[PDB]
Design an enzyme around this catalytic site. Structure first.
Site, PDB file in Angstrom:
ATOM      1  N   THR A 107       4.109   8.533  15.272  1.00 54.22           N
ATOM      2  CA  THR A 107       4.354   8.045  16.471  1.00 54.22           C
ATOM      3  C   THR A 107       3.584   8.378  17.679  1.00 54.22           C
ATOM      4  O   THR A 107       3.986   9.132  18.475  1.00 54.22           O
ATOM      5  CB  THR A 107       5.732   8.660  16.535  1.00 54.22           C
ATOM      6  OG1 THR A 107       5.670  10.040  16.815  1.00 54.22           O
ATOM      7  CG2 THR A 107       6.662   8.415  15.461  1.00 54.22           C
TER       8      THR A 107
ATOM      9  N   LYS B 236       3.867  -0.565  14.224  1.00 50.24           N
ATOM     10  CA  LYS B 236       4.743  -0.156  15.412  1.00 50.24           C
ATOM     11  C   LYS B 236       4.621  -0.999  16.667  1.00 50.24           C
ATOM     12  O   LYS B 236       5.416  -1.037  17.656  1.00 50.24           O
ATOM     13  CB  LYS B 236       4.257   1.182  15.954  1.00 50.24           C
ATOM     14  CG  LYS B 236       5.165   2.246  14.995  1.00 50.24           C
ATOM     15  CD  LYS B 236       4.583   3.677  15.132  1.00 50.24           C
ATOM     16  CE  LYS B 236       4.848   4.567  13.854  1.00 50.24           C
ATOM     17  NZ  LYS B 236       4.579   5.803  13.953  1.00 50.24           N
TER      18      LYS B 236
ATOM     19  N   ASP C  38      -0.263   4.131  16.558  1.00 50.59           N
ATOM     20  CA  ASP C  38      -0.622   4.492  15.379  1.00 50.59           C
ATOM     21  C   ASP C  38      -0.095   3.691  14.076  1.00 50.59           C
ATOM     22  O   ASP C  38       0.665   2.830  14.385  1.00 50.59           O
ATOM     23  CB  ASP C  38      -0.520   6.197  15.255  1.00 50.59           C
ATOM     24  CG  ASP C  38       1.167   6.346  15.386  1.00 50.59           C
ATOM     25  OD1 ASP C  38       1.945   5.484  15.489  1.00 50.59           O
ATOM     26  OD2 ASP C  38       1.483   7.517  15.190  1.00 50.59           O
TER      27      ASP C  38
ATOM     28  N   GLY D 144      10.844   6.954  18.839  1.00 49.38           N
ATOM     29  CA  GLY D 144      11.942   7.330  18.313  1.00 49.38           C
ATOM     30  C   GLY D 144      12.567   6.877  16.883  1.00 49.38           C
ATOM     31  O   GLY D 144      11.696   6.717  15.991  1.00 49.38           O
TER      32      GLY D 144
ATOM     33  N   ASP E  48      -2.082  15.612  16.946  1.00 47.55           N
ATOM     34  CA  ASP E  48      -0.666  15.928  16.426  1.00 47.55           C
ATOM     35  C   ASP E  48      -0.548  15.511  15.135  1.00 47.55           C
ATOM     36  O   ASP E  48      -1.158  14.817  14.352  1.00 47.55           O
ATOM     37  CB  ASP E  48       0.007  14.820  17.261  1.00 47.55           C
ATOM     38  CG  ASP E  48       1.629  14.676  16.873  1.00 47.55           C
ATOM     39  OD1 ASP E  48       1.982  15.458  16.119  1.00 47.55           O
ATOM     40  OD2 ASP E  48       2.399  13.818  17.721  1.00 47.55           O
TER      41      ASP E  48
ATOM     42  N   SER F  86       1.541  11.996  14.029  1.00 50.13           N
ATOM     43  CA  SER F  86       0.905  10.824  14.169  1.00 50.13           C
ATOM     44  C   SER F  86      -0.374  10.931  13.280  1.00 50.13           C
ATOM     45  O   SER F  86      -1.010  11.738  13.452  1.00 50.13           O
ATOM     46  CB  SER F  86       0.704  10.528  15.800  1.00 50.13           C
ATOM     47  OG  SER F  86       1.885  10.724  16.285  1.00 50.13           O
TER      48      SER F  86
ATOM     49  N   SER G  91       5.586  11.431  19.765  1.00 51.19           N
ATOM     50  CA  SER G  91       5.344  12.971  19.648  1.00 51.19           C
ATOM     51  C   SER G  91       4.015  13.187  20.160  1.00 51.19           C
ATOM     52  O   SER G  91       3.725  14.202  20.679  1.00 51.19           O
ATOM     53  CB  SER G  91       5.585  13.291  18.054  1.00 51.19           C
ATOM     54  OG  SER G  91       4.276  13.375  17.496  1.00 51.19           O
TER      55      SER G  91
ATOM     56  N   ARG H 214       2.004   5.407  10.987  1.00 54.17           N
ATOM     57  CA  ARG H 214       2.575   6.345  10.208  1.00 54.17           C
ATOM     58  C   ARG H 214       4.213   6.722  10.567  1.00 54.17           C
ATOM     59  O   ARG H 214       4.345   6.749  11.719  1.00 54.17           O
ATOM     60  CB  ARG H 214       1.937   7.782  10.515  1.00 54.17           C
ATOM     61  CG  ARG H 214       2.524   8.781   9.917  1.00 54.17           C
ATOM     62  CD  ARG H 214       1.880  10.195  10.383  1.00 54.17           C
ATOM     63  NE  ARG H 214       0.602  10.393   9.505  1.00 54.17           N
ATOM     64  CZ  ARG H 214       0.153  11.710   9.313  1.00 54.17           C
ATOM     65  NH1 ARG H 214       0.430  12.735   9.971  1.00 54.17           N
ATOM     66  NH2 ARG H 214      -1.228  11.514   8.431  1.00 54.17           N
TER      67      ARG H 214
END
Lengths: 219, 251, 215, 242, 242, 229, 235, 229
Positions: free
Chosen positions: A1, A33, A17, A47, A166, A169, A129, A19
């Site tokens: 995310t 996404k 991304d 979210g 991160d 992600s 995130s 994932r």
């Protein structure tokens, strides 16, 4: 995310991304996404994937129905007012931070929606995130009126910063260019290779146990 | 039954006589409103006269109040001609749509969408027998998102054609000829360098059409024009001081 | 998704066939089994197989709705319903209960049924696997290979990742999905009282019930 | 007040009948004919396609014999427009029974549901009745093959063979004179052609015309319908023996 | 008129909408009402001529002069019930405006909202159209007064003085003799009595302290609604002529 | 955030910081808080960002609805012709100015727009607004809509947001009854800058909007503070 | 006429609503009822109707509140709806607040109840006219017609032979200064006798009569008390 | 009492109100649909209007979805309300199932709406006939919806005035394996011969499916090349 987008000289560039995670583990390494709202506006979200995926479908088809009754290409601000009113009704439950960017009679405009129904027009942003990781490299390198090519690889660095730094992600990065005439959605764009590849070792035919085998043929 | 009194019931020839009768109700007021469309400019005219109805005509009414021209938003204007009550009810319905469209969609309604939405209700009357048509036919002008003028006329029968030189009133049978003829002069003139000449190419064209459609003299206190040209985009009623200025271009 | 009525559902894609598998347990409480016939794999259509995992009340209640709408769609259509149309329906059905969720994690498995000419003298064409996986609020986590849900979703992801190969025939695919399931159920204490692998091809459908450890 | 404009569609006549239903029965007595036949193998429904033009697709469709469920199907005779209202309704009924009781709906129970809604309009509501009546043939494991004939009034009746539509009398007469109790599927199909040909006083059918379907439960309720090609053999067979 | 004049929601073949012009002859056979503007304030007038033969009403009980927001005079001439329905609706709109805007509703949109409420009843089978002609007036200092007359079927028209009722033709021809916009309001009371004494068809004759009652909104009333005290009526009753 | 409103001799001045912080993190810098409702009045919005934005959208819909409703029929003011800097000293002071549609017949009162809020957010909705604009009857005026729908007309100045408390006494001292445009601009610029120096809800650039009888001018200022002590 | 009568919506070509003009004469069939307003008293008397010499006389006078009473004349069923409405209105006002309902405001509240049954076509106009006689702070008499309308009077009469009773009242101006209720109650009773047909039943102890005034709450006149009043009427 | 059917069975068993609606459909401008091996053509003639009108502002051939067009022949007011309501179904379907709605289910849904006004109370039947054409995974389609509500599957059809001989003309000039280019040629000719005073330019309209391309409406530049023959 890790999703992001920036405004360029005459187009908007959205990157994300690939994932989806149950939180401790990853479901798939390739989840689109980015989303098609209309030919001239695209949206990316974060979210919960449940509310996020329906709302874009609800938004895309309301926009298309609007673009049919009306005879002009959809307005970017029309969707922002449509989503935020939808998000405002469900006080904060439909948690989905969304960036939608596109072009209309006005300039290339990009909006960052928020789960509680707030929106804001930005030159560049990032959610998810890995937003903080992605936003850092965006600010350090963003300029005004970047060329499409130069701004395109900035998102590559913007996403890859969230890909690597991160945990939530990772995977391939995908980009969408939302120029006035049409879009260009590139599904694979990055994520290098050369790790220790698993050797394929299929178990032989006489395995399993199968107490019963109720074979039948349909037509 | 023999009741062709219903608003909807098809007569044996396939016609709805109530639609024809409602249209006849608009003609009965013999109020003529003319609007023409130019290059990035639209103008609209009415007659500022009492609708031909039962009540006694003009004796003490302040003629300033008597107008057939309203505005729907800051950028969309209309000229409803018909029964005075229906015209007043039509604009309030029209105003709500443009207001609701703004709140629901975050941008101002198109001049063509507003009248299409209006016609989608006038159809409901046409099909439900429990109510009655608004004897109101209106003309709507505005500017789209491409800075292009728009002119649309709707009818007591739901019909939203949208012209480029439109006339409503009791003389539309022959006003279609003069308006077509008088609008060709600005086509025969191929100077094509008119830089914001709505004042002296479009407004004067519309006033000339009214002077020709109905053969009175058009005193400046018995007409009114409204223009939504680019560089204004506001549907401002043109003041009387310069309406008679064009009326002094009889030469 | 609950430990109550612990059960998992697995689907996998071969070269020209797909296999859907599940465990047959029905556990009343967490650690208390009552039945080992509770097949969680249902036949929505001739080539549309859905796998419901989670609370058995919502497994059955959702299955009634799915079967009530697929039949309504097909009968009103005089045409066989395809997966990607059905799959999106399942996504919206779950979402319609966004705030009173159906506690299930469905799997949709079945061929995609392209319709080009296939020849100068043919009508319909080859099939595509079309695996996909959801959650309780209906997130279409579409995937080109194995998809899993259930209490052993995390146990199944590890094994499938290390054993799945790109393309396999009906015989090859069945063995891998069986090993990916038996040895993943043996690491769960709330599921896996007997498996039921159902590998299907464009021509035939094979139902096998493995001799799974019952513990 | 539209009291003067009302027709009182739900009001008794001086002789105790309902004029709206009286006229609706007249409407379905001028529609195309539909034949029902119960054989030992299965139930036969065959209706006559009213000619409109040769430009009709007439390949993958016909508007007389629809599918209500995998084990129930109907042959409509009357206003084709509002049949689809009742067909969709009965499709909903037959699928909601399966939703509640987890088993397919018996035919005798669907008919009473679709006849209650058909009757309700002529009981209260001030609306016109459904000018439509259709045979509803189906197979149920309880009482085997069944055939029910509905009515705009809402009152149905089980039958072994019925020929509603225009010129029904000339088609009930031939059915009554040649419907043996025990018939094979191919034998019944030939009978359906004979009664369809004689009802519209044609010696031989044309296959750009009357269409046929059946159930013939094979432990799986095959529910087959004829494209025009299969009916030439039926037409050929009729010619050989008649 | 051949059956097209029954319901309000039917247009006659000549376009004229009947059942509304019949209302117009209902108000025009009712007690006249008057309202004109002066240089200080609007003065209204209601001549209850129909209430002369009764001889039992309380002296100054009946009153068709109503006010809203204490600075807007509303008078009517028609059915005293139907109009009273509108006044309560006019007051409701004024209240609704204040609950939202902290400001008395401007008159020019009060007449708009009332015009729509009155007109909304001329659009249906069942609803009976109102039988009242409404006169609304208000005076301010920065802007002089203004009078609107809301006829049946919408049609709110701004006047500088209007008479509605039975003899409105014989009143207007006498009012327009003098430009009352330059006439004081105190001495305009004398003038309207001379019209009541003459232009009224002997309904009112020298005994009219009770039949006619009226009010102004002028400077001496601080630009607020006020019925004239009886000590000012009698000095205005210096009507002794011939 | 912070929000100021100062009433000077011939107008009202609204200023705000531009930052929407979300728990010691700025979701975005340069967020508009001086929102235009009508050509003659603007709104300063504070509190929860989601609530304030969705209130403003409702009010604009009411404002449009009541603007064209109180449009008188005919033509007015036939012959009447009633009509009438800071020069980048504060660095990077962006600027543009627009003119009204004067005489104020169409546009509605500020007090009208003000109690829309009470009638709308007399609820469980957390947002504090400051209303400022020109009006035909009451020349220039400044309404402060409080947290639960408590309007009071502020005849001198109004402050809101988190940073208001840090300049509550700074502004009460520097205020004068009739300040000129230049003094009011400097006062309102320094008030925000001081409310920003010592508050972690300090914006980026600060947006100052001036409402006058016949025009509105909007400035954006990019500056910081450096005390010498 | 024949066409302009069926519903309560159509206006006659002279603008007359026949279906409320017709209900306005249902009050003209009820028995006479007379209200007289003194300086500080109100006297209401009505003639009860006996359908047979076995039946009890029908009730004419009804009590609404402490100082409010009415005397219907029309359709009895329609009046019973209005008395319940008025009673439930004065009580609610005395409950929500602690005051007495404003009689002027109460009449308007019941005068528009007539109205709502006139706009629609599924309803009919009330066939009953009322005589709202009350002493709020001053004596006052009201009358509501079947069409939405009400007036404040100084004397009334209802229907049967009201023109005969009105002539007695129209020529009597004493009623304003007629203190000493004895002198006032006789004036009303003589009026009621005037409407009463000669060579028929005379005014007997089966005719309603009630008073309300300054410190006199709405009270019936008891038959023993009423009986001597009838005696002075014979004089 | 205000919801009672105005469409009632006549004594001779005919819904006479529908027969009146079909009379008016049989007096409107002829719309025409033809399907070919690789596409569907819907064509209507829009009578040569005055130069005052804007021809593009009214189009009898509107578009339902990406591959589903439409054309009508009846009252223009009812087309808009039906077209707008038809687009909701095409969107409501896609909000459940991913794919675009297909013609067979769209026609059945619309026909159920035309039937409702035939039966429900206080309303009149729709006074128009539609020709919904589209491209699906089940090939090409061309349906027609009557005012009665019943719908037919067609290979070529006409609905407008004088469609009796108009459709007879098509029967002798139509074959199943007709090329789409030839289909437009035949579509122009049949409209040309029916249109009295043949001036078939600026007064015609074409909509094409083109073998699973998105539904496109040919602007007049792409039409004049089809009027040579």
């Amino acid at each position: 995310t890790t999703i992001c987008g920036l405004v360029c000289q005459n187009a908007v560039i959205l990157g994300a991304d690939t994932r989806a995670t149950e939180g401790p583990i990853v479901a798939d390494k390739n989840c689109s996404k980015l989303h098609y709202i209309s030919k001239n506006i695209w949206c990316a979200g974060a979210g919960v994937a449940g509310d996020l995926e329906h709302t874009t479908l609800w938004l895309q088809h309301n926009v298309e129905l609007h673009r049919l009754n009306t005879n002009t290409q959809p307005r970017v601000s029309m969707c922002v007012s449509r989503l935020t009113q939808e998000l405002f009704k469900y006080q904060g439950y439909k948690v989905c931070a969304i960036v939608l960017g596109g072009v209309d009679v006005n300039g290339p405009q990009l909006y960052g929606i928020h789960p509680h129904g707030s929106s804001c027009l930005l030159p560049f942003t990032a959610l998810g995130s890995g937003s903080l990781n992605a936003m850092a490299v965006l600010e350090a390198k963003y300029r005004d009126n970047m060329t499409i090519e130069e701004g395109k690889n900035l998102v590559c660095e913007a996403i890859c910063a969230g890909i690597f730094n991160d945990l939530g992600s990772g995977g391939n990065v995908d980009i969408c260019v939302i120029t006035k005439d049409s879009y260009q959605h590139i599904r694979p764009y990055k994520e290098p290779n050369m790790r220790l590849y698993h050797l394929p070792h299929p178990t032989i035919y006489p395995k399993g146990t199968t107490p019963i085998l109720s074979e039948k043929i349909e037509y | 039954s023999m009741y062709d009194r219903h608003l909807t019931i098809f007569s044996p020839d396939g016609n709805l006589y109530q639609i024809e009768y409602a249209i006849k109700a608009v003609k009965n007021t013999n109020i003529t409103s003319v609007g023409v469309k130019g290059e990035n400019c639209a103008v609209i005219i009415s007659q500022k006269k009492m609708a031909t109805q039962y009540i006694s005509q003009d004796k003490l009414l302040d003629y300033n109040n008597i107008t057939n021209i309203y505005n729907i938003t800051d950028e969309i204007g209309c000229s409803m001609v018909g029964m005075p009550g229906d015209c007043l009810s039509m604009v309030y319905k029209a105003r709500s749509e443009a207001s609701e469209f703004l709140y629901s969609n975050g941008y101002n309604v198109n001049a063509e969408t507003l009248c299409r939405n209006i016609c989608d209700k006038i159809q409901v009357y046409t099909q439900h027998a429990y109510m009655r048509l608004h004897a109101c036919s209106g003309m709507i002008i505005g500017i789209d998102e491409n800075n292009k003028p728009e002119l649309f006329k709707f009818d007591p029968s739901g019909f939203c054609a949208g012209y480029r030189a439109c006339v409503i009133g009791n003389k539309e049978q022959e006003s279609i000829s003069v308006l077509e003829r008088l609008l060709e002069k600005r086509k025969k003139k191929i100077q094509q360098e008119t830089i914001d000449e709505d004042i002296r190419n479009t407004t004067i064209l519309a006033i000339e059409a009214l002077q020709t459609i109905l053969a009175f003299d058009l005193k400046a206190s018995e007409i009114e024009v409204a223009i939504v040209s680019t560089k204004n985009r506001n549907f401002t009623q043109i003041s009387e001081k310069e309406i008679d200025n064009y009326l002094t271009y009889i030469a | 998704i609950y430990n109550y009525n612990g059960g998992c559902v697995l689907g996998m894609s071969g070269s020209n066939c797909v296999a859907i598998a599940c465990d047959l347990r029905l556990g009343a409480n967490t650690f208390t089994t009552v039945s080992t016939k509770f097949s969680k794999i249902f036949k929505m259509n001739n080539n549309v197989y859905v796998g419901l995992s989670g609370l058995a009340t919502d497994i059955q209640t959702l299955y009634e709705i799915l079967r009530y709408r697929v039949n309504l769609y097909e009968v009103r259509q005089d045409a066989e319903m395809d997966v990607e149309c059905f799959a999106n329906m399942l996504s919206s059905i779950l979402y319609s209960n966004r705030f009173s969720p159906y506690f299930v994690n469905p799997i949709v498995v079945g061929f995609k049924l392209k319709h080009y000419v296939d020849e100068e003298g043919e009508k319909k064409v080859n099939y595509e696997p079309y695996l996909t996986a959801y959650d309780l609020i209906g997130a279409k986590c579409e995937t080109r290979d194995f998809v899993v849900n259930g209490v052993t979703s995390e146990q199944l992801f590890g094994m499938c990742e290390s054993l799945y190969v790109k393309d396999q025939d009906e015989n090859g695919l069945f063995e891998t999905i069986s090993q990916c399931l038996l040895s993943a159920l043996d690491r769960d204490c709330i599921s896996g009282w007997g498996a039921e692998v159902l590998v299907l091809t464009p021509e035939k459908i094979i139902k096998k019930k493995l001799k799974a450890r019952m513990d | 007040m539209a009291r003067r404009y009302d027709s009182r569609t739900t009001t008794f006549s001086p002789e105790g009948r309902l004029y709206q239903v009286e006229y609706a029965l007249e409407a379905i007595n001028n529609a195309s004919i539909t034949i029902g036949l119960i054989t030992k193998d299965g139930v036969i429904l065959g209706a006559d396609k009213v000619f409109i033009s040769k430009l009709i697709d007439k390949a993958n469709n016909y508007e007389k014999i629809y599918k209500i469920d995998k084990h129930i199907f109907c042959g409509v005779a009357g206003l084709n427009a509002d049949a689809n209202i009742l067909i969709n309704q009965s499709r909903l009924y037959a699928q909601r029974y399966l939703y509640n009781y987890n088993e397919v709906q018996p035919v005798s129970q669907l008919v009473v549901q679709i006849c209650d809604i058909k009757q309700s309009y002529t009981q209260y509501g001030g609306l016109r009745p459904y000018g439509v009546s259709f045979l509803i043939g189906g197979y149920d494991t309880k009482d085997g093959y069944q055939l029910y004939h509905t009515d705009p009034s809402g009152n149905y009746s089980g039958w072994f063979a019925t020929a509603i539509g225009t010129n029904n009398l000339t088609a009930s007469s031939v059915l009554k004179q040649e419907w043996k109790n025990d018939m094979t599927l191919e034998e019944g199909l030939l009978l359906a052609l004979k009664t369809l040909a004689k009802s519209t006083d044609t010696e031989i059918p044309k296959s750009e015309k009357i269409e046929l379907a059946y159930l013939t439960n094979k432990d799986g309720e095959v529910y087959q319908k004829y494209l025009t090609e299969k009916e030439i053999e039926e037409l050929i067979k009729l010619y050989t023996q008649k | 008129s051949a059956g097209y004049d029954l319901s309000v929601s039917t247009f006659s073949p000549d376009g004229r909408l009947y059942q509304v012009e019949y209302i117009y002859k209902s108000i025009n056979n009712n007690n006249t009402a008057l309202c004109l503007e002066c240089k200080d304030g609007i003065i209204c007038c209601c001549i209850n001529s129909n209430m002369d033969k009764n001889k039992m009403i309380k002296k100054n009980s009946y009153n068709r002069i109503y006010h809203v927001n204490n600075n807007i005079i509303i008078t009517y001439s028609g059915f005293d019930g139907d109009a009273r329905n509108i006044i309560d609706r006019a007051r409701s709109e004024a209240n609704t405006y204040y609950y939202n805007f902290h400001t008395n509703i401007p008159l020019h949109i009060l007449v708009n909202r009332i015009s729509l409420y009155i007109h909304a009843y001329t659009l249906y089978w069942h609803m009976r159209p109102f039988a009242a002609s409404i006169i609304i007036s208000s005076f301010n200092e920065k802007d002089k007064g203004d009078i609107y007359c809301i006829e049946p079927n919408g049609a709110c028209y701004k006047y500088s003085g209007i008479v509605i009722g039975k003899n409105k033709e014989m009143f207007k021809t006498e009012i327009e003799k003098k430009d009352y916009k330059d006439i004081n309001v105190r001495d305009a009371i004398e003038d309207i009595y001379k019209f009541i004494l003459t232009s009224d068809d002997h309904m009112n004759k020298n005994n009219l302290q009770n039949l006619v009652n009226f009010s102004w909104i002028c400077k001496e009333s601080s630009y607020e609604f006020q019925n004239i005290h009886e000590e000012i009526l009698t000095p205005a009753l210096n009507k002794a002529v011939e | 955030t912070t929000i100021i409103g100062i009433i000077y001799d011939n107008g009202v001045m609204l200023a705000c910081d531009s930052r929407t912080s979300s728990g010691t993190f700025i979701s975005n810098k340069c967020s508009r808080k001086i929102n235009r409702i009508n050509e003659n009045l603007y709104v300063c919005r504070s509190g929860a960002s989601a609530h304030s934005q969705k209130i403003i959208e409702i009010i604009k819909h009411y404002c449009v609805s009541m603007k064209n409703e109180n449009r008188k029929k005919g033509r007015f003011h036939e012959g009447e012709t009633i009509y009438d800097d800071n020069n980048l000293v504060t660095k990077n002071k962006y600027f543009y100015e627009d003119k009204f549609n004067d005489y104020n017949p169409l546009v509605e009162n500020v007090a009208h727009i003000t109690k829309k809020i009470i009638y709308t957010n007399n609820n469980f909705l957390s947002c504090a607004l400051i209303f400022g604009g020109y009006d035909k009857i009451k020349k220039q005026q400044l309404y402060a809509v409080n947290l639960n729908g408590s309007i009071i007309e502020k005849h001198d100045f109004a402050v809101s947001g988190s940073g208001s408390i840090y300049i509550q006494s700074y502004l009460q001292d520097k205020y004068k009854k009739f300040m000129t445009k230049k003094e009011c601009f400097n006062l309102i610029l320094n008030c925000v800058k001081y409310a920003m120096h010592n508050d972690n809800s300090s914006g980026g650039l600060i947006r100052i909007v001036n409402i006058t009888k016949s025009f509105v001018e909007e400035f954006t200022v990019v500056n910081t503070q450096m005390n010498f002590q | 006429r024949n066409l302009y009568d069926t519903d309560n919506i159509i206006y006659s070509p002279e603008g007359r609503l026949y279906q409320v003009e017709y209900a306005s004469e249902a009050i003209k069939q009820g028995t006479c009822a007379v209200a007289i307003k003194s300086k500080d008293y109100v006297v209401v008397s009505g003639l009860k109707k006996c359908i047979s010499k076995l039946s009890f006389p029908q009730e004419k006078i009804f009590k609404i509140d402490d100082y409010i009473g009415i005397s219907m004349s029309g359709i009895t069923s329609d009046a019973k709806v209005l008395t319940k409405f008025m009673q439930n209105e004065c009580l609610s006002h005395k409950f929500l607040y602690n005051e007495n309902i404003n009689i002027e405001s109460l009449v308007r509240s019941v005068a528009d109840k007539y109205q709502k049954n006139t706009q629609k076509s599924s309803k009919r106009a009330f066939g009953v006219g009322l005589m709202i006689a009350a002493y709020h702070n001053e004596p006052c008499i009201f009358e509501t017609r079947p069409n939405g309308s009400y007036f404040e009077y100084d004397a009334l009469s209802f229907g049967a032979r009201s023109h005969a009773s009105k002539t007695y009242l129209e020529k009597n101006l004493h009623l304003f200064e007629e203190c000493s209720l004895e002198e006032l109650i006789l004036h009303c009773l003589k009026a009621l006798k005037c409407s009463l047909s000669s060579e028929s039943e005379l005014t007997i102890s089966n005719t309603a009569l009630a008073v309300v005034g300054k410190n006199h709450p709405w009270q019936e006149i008891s038959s023993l008390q009423l009986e001597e009043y009838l005696s002075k009427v014979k004089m | 009492e205000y919801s009672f059917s105005l469409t009632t069975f006549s004594p001779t068993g005919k819904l006479v109100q529908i027969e009146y609606a079909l009379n008016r459909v049989s007096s409107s401008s002829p719309a025409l649909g033809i399907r070919a091996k690789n596409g569907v053509i819907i064509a209507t003639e829009k009578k040569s209007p005055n130069e005052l009108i804007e021809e593009n502002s009214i189009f009898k051939i509107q578009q339902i979805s990406e591959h589903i067009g439409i054309v009508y022949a009846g009252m223009p007011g009812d087309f808009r309300v039906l077209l707008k309501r038809a687009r909701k179904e095409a969107i409501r379907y896609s909000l459940q199932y991913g794919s675009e709605i297909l013609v067979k289910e769209l026609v059945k849904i619309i026909a159920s709406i035309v039937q409702e006004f035939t039966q429900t109370g206080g309303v009149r039947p729709f006074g128009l006939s539609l020709l919904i054409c589209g491209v699906d995974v089940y090939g090409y389609h061309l349906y027609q919806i009557d005012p009665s509500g019943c719908y037919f599957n067609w290979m070529a059809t006409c609905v407008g005035k004088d469609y009796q001989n108009n459709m007879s003309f098509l029967e002798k000039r139509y074959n199943k394996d007709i090329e789409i280019e030839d289909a437009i040629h035949t579509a122009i000719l049949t409209l040309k011969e029916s249109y009295e005073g043949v001036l078939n330019e600026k007064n015609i309209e074409i909509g094409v499916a083109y073998d699973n391309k998105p539904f496109k409406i040919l602007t007049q530049n792409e039409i004049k090349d089809y009027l040579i023959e």
